[PDB]
Amino acid sequence: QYSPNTQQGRTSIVHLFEWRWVDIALECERYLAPKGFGGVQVSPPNENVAIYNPFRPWWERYQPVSYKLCTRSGNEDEFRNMVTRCNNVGVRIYVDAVINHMCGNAVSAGTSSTCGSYFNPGSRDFPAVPYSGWDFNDGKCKTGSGDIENYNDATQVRDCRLTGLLDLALEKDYVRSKIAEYMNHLIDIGVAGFRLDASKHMWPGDIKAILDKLHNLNSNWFPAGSKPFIYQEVIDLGGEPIKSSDYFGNGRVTEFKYGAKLGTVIRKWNGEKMSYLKNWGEGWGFVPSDRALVFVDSHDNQRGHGAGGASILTFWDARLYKMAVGFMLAHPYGFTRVMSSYRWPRQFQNGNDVNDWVGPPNNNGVIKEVTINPDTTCGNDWVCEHRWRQIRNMVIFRNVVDGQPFTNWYDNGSNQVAFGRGNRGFIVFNNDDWSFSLTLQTGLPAGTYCDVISGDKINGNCTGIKIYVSDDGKAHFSISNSAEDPFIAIHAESKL
Numbered sequence: 266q267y268s269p270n271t272q273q274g275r276t277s278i279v280h281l282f283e284w285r286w287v288d289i290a291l292e293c294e295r296y297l298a299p300k301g302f303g304g305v306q307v308s309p310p311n312e313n314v315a316i317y318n319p320f321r322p323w324w325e326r327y328q329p330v331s332y333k334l335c336t337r338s339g340n341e342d343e344f345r346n347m348v349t350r351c352n353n354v355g356v357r358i359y360v361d362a363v364i365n366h367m368c369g370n371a372v373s374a375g376t377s378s379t380c381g382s383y384f385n386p387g388s389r390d391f392p393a394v395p396y397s398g399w400d401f402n403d404g405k406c407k408t409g410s411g412d413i414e415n416y417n418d419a420t421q422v423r424d425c426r427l428t429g430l431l432d433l434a435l436e437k438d439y440v441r442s443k444i445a446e447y448m449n450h451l452i453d454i455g456v457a458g459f460r461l462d463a464s465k466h467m468w469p470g471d472i473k474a475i476l477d478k479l480h481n482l483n484s485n486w487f488p489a490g491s492k493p494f495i496y497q498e499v500i501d502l503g504g505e506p507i508k509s510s511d512y513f514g515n516g517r518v519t520e521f522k523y524g525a526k527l528g529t530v531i532r533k534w535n536g537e538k539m540s541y542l543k544n545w546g547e548g549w550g551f552v553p554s555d556r557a558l559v560f561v562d563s564h565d566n567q568r569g570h571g572a573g574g575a576s577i578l579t580f581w582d583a584r585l586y587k588m589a590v591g592f593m594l595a596h597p598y599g600f601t602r603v604m605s606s607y608r609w610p611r612q613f614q615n616g617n618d619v620n621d622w623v624g625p626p627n628n629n630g631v632i633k634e635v636t637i638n639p640d641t642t643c644g645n646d647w648v649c650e651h652r653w654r655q656i657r658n659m660v661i662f663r664n665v666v667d668g669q670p671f672t673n674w675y676d677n678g679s680n681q682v683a684f685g686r687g688n689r690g691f692i693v694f695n696n697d698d699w700s701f702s703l704t705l706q707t708g709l710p711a712g713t714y715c716d717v718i719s720g721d722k723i724n725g726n727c728t729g730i731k732i733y734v735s736d737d738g739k740a741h742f743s744i745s746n747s748a749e750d751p752f753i754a755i756h757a758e759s760k761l
């Protein structure tokens with residue numbers, strides 16, 4: 266469960282949020298594989314409700330109608346083509362598995378689904394699966410509204426409807442089998458693992474029963490006995506009866522405290538300062554590193570739809586965001602997930618964004634293709650943070666230093682810190698309102714290194730800042746609080 270099943274040497278996955286299958290296939294071949302990315306988290310590949318009011322929101326994909334691989338991202342043929350091509354180039358595919366529920370109980374019956382499948386939420390009828398009233402938790406939930414009302418009651422959190430979403434009776438073998446059937450179809454197609462959506466809303470034991478029904482990975486691409494990588498979306502910020510540790514037996518869990526705390530520290534909110542990150546990791550009350558799936562922001566909380574709130578850093582806060590992602594990718598804690606989003610017209614009214622529902626770039630509901638500009642950035646409103654030099658290079662930094670211990674820490678008692686990863690990498694940050702100019706012990710072998718944040722190493726030369734490491738392993742670093750990116754990173758492979 267716990268192993269990503271990524272090709273050796275690749276240490277991160279990227280969430281290509283709302284991308285079309287054909288675009289992801291191309292991205293695997295033209296960018297992801299060459300750049301060392303380990304895999305891609307795709308949006309739900311199963312048929313969902315087509316919601317027109319609001320107009321095709323991103324969240325309509327979290328309201329299943331059937332398990333037919335037919336969505337705005339493409340059909341099954343296109344999906345299989347994507348998995349095959351990505352696998353052939355060593356980039357894994359992780360499917361966002363929405364198995365906790367079906368669509369909203371209030372959704373109108375009809376064929377307003379991404380594949381034309383008929384469904385009647387009112388009568389609990391989903392013939393395309395098929396599911397009926399006996400397959401839901403309506404009779405098991407004890408709240409007056411039928412929805413989840415109190416998170417202090419671990420039971421209703423699991424048996425009731427999350428914001429109205431029809432709750433599947435996961436204790437039933439029939440339902441467990443229909444879900445496993447769907448997941449095995451994908452595993453045999455070639456996917457390497459799954460993001461279990463709303464895992465907090467499922468009993469650890471029900472999830473385990475489903476996983477036990479899963480096949481080993483497709484033997485045409487994976488070694489015998491390979492089990493699917495599982496990461497469970499459990500929002501545990503403490504203070505609730507449900508703990509993410511209860512899910513350790515099924516696989517990894519998303520550590521949402523990670524992004525929220527890194528956000529307040531980097532924003533320097535209420536006394537926080539980077540010097541405190543000296544013992545970042547379990548030392549901050551996070552889950553064990555070998556069970557953690559970490560990230561700075563996710564599709565959910567980058568738009569206020571998840572835990573983290575205001576402290577969360579997103580592409581909107583470019584400068585601080587790159588620094589946050591940089592720290593995450595350099596630090597040994599957890600398995601890292603990189604976000605890749607699209608721009609939407611944020612409309613803040615009384616502190617909140619009224620356009621947080623806006624779906625991906627589209628033409629009359631048809632998702633726009635991801636166009637690559639000559640500078641390698643994306644068009645059609647796709648942000649493509651994974652293509653930002655500072656981020657992409659830190660993705661490589663992680664691959665390069667994989668295995669190396671956290672060493673040579675330094676901090677000025679405020680917001681200027683630095684540390685290395687064995688003798689394969691070193692990173693320095695300046696988040697103070699004054700310049701940083703100091704000679705530090707890097708632990709790297711003497712030589713000239715290209716700073717991978719400001720530039721790239723391009724055949725015996727750096728296009729950006731260069732750092733000179735002496736025989737001592739010492740090197741001078743100068744970072745002005747006015748720098749575009751107030752941090753420097755060098756590693757064994759950016760060595761001239």
Ligand SMILES: C[C@H]1O[C@H](O[C@H]2[C@H](O)[C@@H](O)[C@@H](O[C@H]3[C@H](O)[C@@H](O)[C@@H](O)O[C@@H]3CO)O[C@@H]2CO)[C@H](O)[C@@H](O)[C@@H]1N[C@H]1C=C(CO)[C@@H](O[C@H]2O[C@H](CO)[C@@H](O[C@H]3O[C@H](CO)[C@@H](O)[C@H](O)[C@H]3O)[C@H](O)[C@H]2O)[C@H](O)[C@H]1O
Pocket residue numbers: 324325326327328368369370416427428429430462463464465466498500502505565570571572573574
């Ligand atoms: C959104 C999160 O809500 C909880 O997350 C809980 C959290 O577990 C709890 O601890 C507390 O958090 C608290 C913190 O504990 C507290 O410390 C402080 O920080 O405040 C937080 C709340 O902001 O509340 C939140 C929100 O209910 C779950 O635990 C977590 O699993 C979930 N995330 C996943 C699940 C779903 C659902 O299928 C998706 O929803 C997404 O699709 C849904 C279905 O289309 C959308 O509903 C949409 O359709 C429904 C129809 O039934 C409508 O009733 C609803 O008004 C509409 O917005 C939803 O807006 C969207 O976010 C997400 O994209 C996906 O990533």
Ligand SMILES: *[C@@H]1O[C@H](CO)[C@@H](O)[C@H](O)[C@H]1NC(C)=O
Pocket residue numbers: 724725726
């Ligand atoms: C490095 O760049 C300089 C020009 O800035 C050039 O003289 C030199 O040939 C380049 N070295 C290599 C190995 O391309």
